[PDB]
């Protein structure tokens, strides 16, 4: 009975990190795309900016 | 000569970098692709 015990509470234990490092690292991806996002509008912008020099 | 070479290489750069942008994309799209693929075994797993 011990042994279950313990076994059932390292289970749960595991779970709830999983859970948690599973919500970070979609929080994670969501912060790395939304940079990911501004550096392309930039480049864009940098983009349009070079097709304008090539009239330079 | 110098303009020409730089512009030439700034152009260069600027396609190497697209490309590693497209690259990048695709890898963003595979990626919420295993979030959905996550999502729905995890809720899977949850139900049962």
Same mark, same amino acid.
């Given at each position: 009975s011990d042994k279950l015990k313990e076994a059932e509470t390292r289970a749960e234990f595991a779970e709830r990190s999983v859970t948690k490092l599973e919500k970070s690292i979609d929080d994670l991806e969501d912060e790395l795309? +939304? #940079?990911?996002?501004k550096y392309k509008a930039i480049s864009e912008e940098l983009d349009h900016?070079?097709?304008?020099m090539t009239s330079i | 000569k110098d303009l020409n070479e730089l512009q030439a290489?700034?152009?260069a750069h600027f396609e190497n970098?697209?490309?590693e942008e497209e690259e990048l994309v695709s890898l963003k799209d595979r990626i919420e /692709? /295993? /979030? +959905?693929? /996550? +999502?729905? #075994? #995890?809720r899977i797993r949850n139900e049962r």
């Open positions: 795309y +939304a #940079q990911k996002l900016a070079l097709n304008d | 290489l700034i152009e970098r697209k490309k /692709r /295993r /979030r +959905a693929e /996550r +999502a729905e #075994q #995890q």
